[PDB]
XYZ file of N, CA and C in Angstrom:
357
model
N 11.767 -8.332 -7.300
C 10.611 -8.770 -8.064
C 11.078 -9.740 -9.125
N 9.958 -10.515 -9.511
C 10.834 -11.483 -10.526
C 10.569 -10.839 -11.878
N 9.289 -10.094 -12.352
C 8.815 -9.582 -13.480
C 7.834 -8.307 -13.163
N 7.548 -8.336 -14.551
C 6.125 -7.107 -14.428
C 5.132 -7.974 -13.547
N 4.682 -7.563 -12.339
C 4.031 -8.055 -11.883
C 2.727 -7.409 -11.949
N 1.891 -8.562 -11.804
C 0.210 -8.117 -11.913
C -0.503 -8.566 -10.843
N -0.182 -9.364 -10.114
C -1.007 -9.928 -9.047
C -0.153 -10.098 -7.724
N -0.688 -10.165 -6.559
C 0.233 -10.278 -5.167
C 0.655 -11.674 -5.404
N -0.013 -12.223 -5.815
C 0.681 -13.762 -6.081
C 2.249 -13.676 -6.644
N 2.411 -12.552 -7.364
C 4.057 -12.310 -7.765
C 4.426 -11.791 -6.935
N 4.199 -10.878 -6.485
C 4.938 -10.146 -4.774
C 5.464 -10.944 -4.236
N 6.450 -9.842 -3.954
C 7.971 -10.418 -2.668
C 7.475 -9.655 -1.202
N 7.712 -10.379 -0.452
C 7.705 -9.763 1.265
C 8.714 -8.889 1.641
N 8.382 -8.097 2.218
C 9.254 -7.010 2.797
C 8.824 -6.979 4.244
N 9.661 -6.818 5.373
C 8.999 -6.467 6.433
C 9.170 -4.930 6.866
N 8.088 -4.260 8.078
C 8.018 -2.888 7.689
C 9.145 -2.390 8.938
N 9.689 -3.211 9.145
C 10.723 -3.122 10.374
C 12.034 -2.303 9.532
N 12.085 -2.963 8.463
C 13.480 -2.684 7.652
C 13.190 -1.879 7.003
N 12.691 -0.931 6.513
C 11.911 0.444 6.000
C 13.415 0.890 5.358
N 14.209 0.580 5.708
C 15.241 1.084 4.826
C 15.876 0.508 3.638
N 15.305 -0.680 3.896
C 15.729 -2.103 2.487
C 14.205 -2.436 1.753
N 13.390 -0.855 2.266
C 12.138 -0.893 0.680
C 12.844 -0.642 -0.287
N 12.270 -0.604 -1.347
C 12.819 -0.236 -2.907
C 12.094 1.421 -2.738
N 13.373 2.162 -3.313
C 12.961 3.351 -3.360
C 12.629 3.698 -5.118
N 11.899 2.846 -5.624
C 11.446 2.584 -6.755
C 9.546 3.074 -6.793
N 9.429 3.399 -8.339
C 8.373 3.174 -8.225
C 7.467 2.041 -8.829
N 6.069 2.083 -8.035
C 5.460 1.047 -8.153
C 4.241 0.914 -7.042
N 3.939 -0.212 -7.289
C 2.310 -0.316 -6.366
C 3.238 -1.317 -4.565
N 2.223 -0.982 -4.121
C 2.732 -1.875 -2.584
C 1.401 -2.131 -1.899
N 1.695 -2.913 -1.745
C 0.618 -3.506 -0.894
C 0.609 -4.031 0.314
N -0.204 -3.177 1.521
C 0.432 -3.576 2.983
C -0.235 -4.622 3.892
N 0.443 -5.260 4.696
C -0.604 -6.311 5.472
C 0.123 -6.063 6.686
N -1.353 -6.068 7.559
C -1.165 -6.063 8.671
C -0.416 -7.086 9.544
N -0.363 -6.329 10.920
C 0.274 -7.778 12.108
C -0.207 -9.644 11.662
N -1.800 -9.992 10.975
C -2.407 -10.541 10.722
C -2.010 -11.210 9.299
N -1.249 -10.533 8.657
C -1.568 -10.588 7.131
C -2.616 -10.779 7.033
N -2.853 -9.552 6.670
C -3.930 -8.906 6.086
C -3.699 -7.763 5.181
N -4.487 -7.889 3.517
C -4.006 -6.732 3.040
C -5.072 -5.794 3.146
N -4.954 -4.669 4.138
C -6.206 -3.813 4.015
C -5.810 -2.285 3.360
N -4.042 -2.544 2.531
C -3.948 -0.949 1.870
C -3.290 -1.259 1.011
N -3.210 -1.179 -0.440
C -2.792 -1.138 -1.285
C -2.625 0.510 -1.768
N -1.830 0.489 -2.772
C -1.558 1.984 -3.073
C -0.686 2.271 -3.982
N -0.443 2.986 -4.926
C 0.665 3.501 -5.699
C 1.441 4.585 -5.395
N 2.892 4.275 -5.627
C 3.369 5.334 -5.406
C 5.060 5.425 -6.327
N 5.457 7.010 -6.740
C 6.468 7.060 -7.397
C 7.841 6.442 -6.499
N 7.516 6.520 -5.327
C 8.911 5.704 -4.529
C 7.822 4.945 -3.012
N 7.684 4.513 -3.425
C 7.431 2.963 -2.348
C 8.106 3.428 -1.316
N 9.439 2.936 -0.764
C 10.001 3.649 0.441
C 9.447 4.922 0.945
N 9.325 5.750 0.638
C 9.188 6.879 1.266
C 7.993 6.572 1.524
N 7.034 6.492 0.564
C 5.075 6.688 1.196
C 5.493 5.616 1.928
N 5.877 4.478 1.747
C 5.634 3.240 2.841
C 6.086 3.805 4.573
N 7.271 4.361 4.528
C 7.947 4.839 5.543
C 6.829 5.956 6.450
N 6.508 6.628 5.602
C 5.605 7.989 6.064
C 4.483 7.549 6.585
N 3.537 6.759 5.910
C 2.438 6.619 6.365
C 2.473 5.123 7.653
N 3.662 4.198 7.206
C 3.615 3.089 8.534
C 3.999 3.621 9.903
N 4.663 4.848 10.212
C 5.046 5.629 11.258
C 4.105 5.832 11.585
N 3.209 7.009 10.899
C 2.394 7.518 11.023
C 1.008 6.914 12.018
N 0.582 5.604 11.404
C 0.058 5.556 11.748
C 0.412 3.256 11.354
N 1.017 3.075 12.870
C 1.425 1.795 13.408
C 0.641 0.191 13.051
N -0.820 0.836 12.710
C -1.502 -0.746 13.367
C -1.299 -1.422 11.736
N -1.119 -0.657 10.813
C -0.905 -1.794 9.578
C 0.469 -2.050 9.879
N 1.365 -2.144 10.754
C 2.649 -2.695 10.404
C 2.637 -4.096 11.091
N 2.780 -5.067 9.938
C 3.398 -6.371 10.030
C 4.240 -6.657 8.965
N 4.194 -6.153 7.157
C 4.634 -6.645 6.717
C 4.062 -5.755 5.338
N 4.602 -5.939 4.147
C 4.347 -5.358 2.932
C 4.954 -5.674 1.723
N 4.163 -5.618 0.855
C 4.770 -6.334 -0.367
C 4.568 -5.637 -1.336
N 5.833 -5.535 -1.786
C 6.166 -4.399 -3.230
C 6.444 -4.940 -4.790
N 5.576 -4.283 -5.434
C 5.749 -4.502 -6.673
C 6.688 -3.337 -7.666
N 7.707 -3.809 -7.661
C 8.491 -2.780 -8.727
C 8.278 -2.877 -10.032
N 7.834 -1.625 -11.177
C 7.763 -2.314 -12.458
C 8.325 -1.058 -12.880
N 9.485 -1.242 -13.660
C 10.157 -0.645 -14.477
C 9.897 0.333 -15.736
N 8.867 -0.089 -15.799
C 8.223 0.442 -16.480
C 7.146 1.863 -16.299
N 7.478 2.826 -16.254
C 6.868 4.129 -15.965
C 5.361 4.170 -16.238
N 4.783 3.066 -16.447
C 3.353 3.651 -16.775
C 2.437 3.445 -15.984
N 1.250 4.504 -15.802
C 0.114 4.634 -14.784
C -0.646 3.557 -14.825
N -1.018 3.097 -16.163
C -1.784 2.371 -16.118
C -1.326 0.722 -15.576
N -0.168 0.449 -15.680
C 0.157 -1.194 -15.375
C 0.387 -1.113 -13.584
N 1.023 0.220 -13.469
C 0.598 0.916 -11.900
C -0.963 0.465 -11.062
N -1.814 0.914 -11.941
C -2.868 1.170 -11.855
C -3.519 -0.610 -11.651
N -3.043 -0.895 -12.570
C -3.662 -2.674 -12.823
C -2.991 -3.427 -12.121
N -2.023 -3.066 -12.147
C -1.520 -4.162 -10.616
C -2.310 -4.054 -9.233
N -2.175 -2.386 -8.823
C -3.001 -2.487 -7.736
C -4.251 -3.175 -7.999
N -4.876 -3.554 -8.948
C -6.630 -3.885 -9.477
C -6.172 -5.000 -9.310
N -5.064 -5.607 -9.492
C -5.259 -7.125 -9.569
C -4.773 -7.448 -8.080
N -4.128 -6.664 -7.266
C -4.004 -6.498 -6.034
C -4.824 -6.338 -4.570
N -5.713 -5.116 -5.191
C -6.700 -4.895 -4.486
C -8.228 -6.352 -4.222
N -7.977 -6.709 -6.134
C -8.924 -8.059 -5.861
C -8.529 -9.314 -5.586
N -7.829 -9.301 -5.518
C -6.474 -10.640 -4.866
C -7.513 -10.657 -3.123
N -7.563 -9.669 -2.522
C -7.808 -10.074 -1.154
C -9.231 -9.654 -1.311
N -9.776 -8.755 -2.346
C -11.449 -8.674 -2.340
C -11.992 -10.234 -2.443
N -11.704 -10.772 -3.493
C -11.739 -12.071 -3.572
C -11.871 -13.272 -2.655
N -10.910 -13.241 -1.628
C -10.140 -14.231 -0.449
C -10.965 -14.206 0.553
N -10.861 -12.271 1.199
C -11.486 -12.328 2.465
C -12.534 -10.808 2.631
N -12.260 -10.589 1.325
C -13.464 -9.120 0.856
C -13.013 -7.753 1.799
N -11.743 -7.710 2.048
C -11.407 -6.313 2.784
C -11.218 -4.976 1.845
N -11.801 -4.008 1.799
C -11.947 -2.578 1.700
C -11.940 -1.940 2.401
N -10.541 -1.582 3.277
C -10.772 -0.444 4.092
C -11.175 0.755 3.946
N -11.216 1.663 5.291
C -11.371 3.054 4.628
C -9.961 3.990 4.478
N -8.979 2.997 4.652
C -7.711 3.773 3.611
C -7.428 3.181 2.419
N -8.110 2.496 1.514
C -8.265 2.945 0.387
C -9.014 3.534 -0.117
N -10.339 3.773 0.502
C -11.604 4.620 -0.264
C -11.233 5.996 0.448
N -11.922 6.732 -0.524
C -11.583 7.877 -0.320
C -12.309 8.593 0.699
N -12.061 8.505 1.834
C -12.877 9.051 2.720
C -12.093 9.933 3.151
N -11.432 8.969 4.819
C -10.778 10.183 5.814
C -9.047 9.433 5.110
N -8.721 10.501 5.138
C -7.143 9.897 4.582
C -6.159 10.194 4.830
N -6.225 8.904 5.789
C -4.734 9.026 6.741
C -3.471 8.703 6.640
N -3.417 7.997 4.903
C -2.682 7.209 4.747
C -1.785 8.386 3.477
N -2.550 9.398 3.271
C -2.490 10.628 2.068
C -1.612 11.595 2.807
N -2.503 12.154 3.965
C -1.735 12.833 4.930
C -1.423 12.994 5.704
N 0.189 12.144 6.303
C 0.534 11.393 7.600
C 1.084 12.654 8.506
N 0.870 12.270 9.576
C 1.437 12.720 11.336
C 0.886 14.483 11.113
N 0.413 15.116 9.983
C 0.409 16.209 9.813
C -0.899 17.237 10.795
N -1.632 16.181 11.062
C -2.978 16.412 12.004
C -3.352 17.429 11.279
N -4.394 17.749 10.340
C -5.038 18.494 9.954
C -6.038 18.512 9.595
N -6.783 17.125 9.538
C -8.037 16.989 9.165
C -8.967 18.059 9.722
N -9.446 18.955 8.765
C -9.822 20.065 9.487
C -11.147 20.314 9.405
N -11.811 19.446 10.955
C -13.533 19.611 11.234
C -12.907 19.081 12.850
N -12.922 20.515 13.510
C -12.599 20.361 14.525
C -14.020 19.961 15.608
N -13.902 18.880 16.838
C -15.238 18.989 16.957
C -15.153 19.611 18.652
């Protein structure tokens, strides 16, 4: 990263191939699909791991992802990056998936199959 970042416009590329050269840092990430496309943004105390867990999990967002490390321990610049993240592509091409809203969440709890409303 070059700084405290606030917007994907500062984001560095990662591809989700190399899952082992994420930053096991925390911070916000933001994923884009085969397409680049960002349809998941997210926070997390180590990036690597949620990134790792949930791109296995579940394949079709893997093309690529971009991590914001900020050194800084706090929720809230956490919090505002993803905001300036999330509207970075609300803005562009208006995507809200439903793994960021809180619906069915697959991206919360990977390969574990439990969504439990069996039909």
């Amino acid at each position: 990263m070059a700084s405290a970042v606030k917007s994907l416009t500062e984001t560095e590329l990662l591809p989700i191939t190399e899952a082992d050269s994420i930053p096991s840092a925390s911070g916000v990430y933001a994923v884009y699909d085969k397409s680049d496309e960002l349809q998941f943004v997210g926070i997390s105390r180590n990036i690597a791991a949620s990134v790792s867990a949930h791109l296995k999990s579940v394949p079709e967002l893997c093309g690529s992802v971009k991590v914001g490390i900020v050194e800084e321990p706090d929720k809230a610049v956490l919090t505002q990056a993803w905001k300036l993240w999330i509207e970075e592509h609300i803005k562009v091409t208006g995507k809200v998936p439903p793994g960021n809203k809180s619906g069915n969440n697959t991206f919360v709890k990977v390969t574990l199959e439990h969504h439990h409303h069996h039909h």
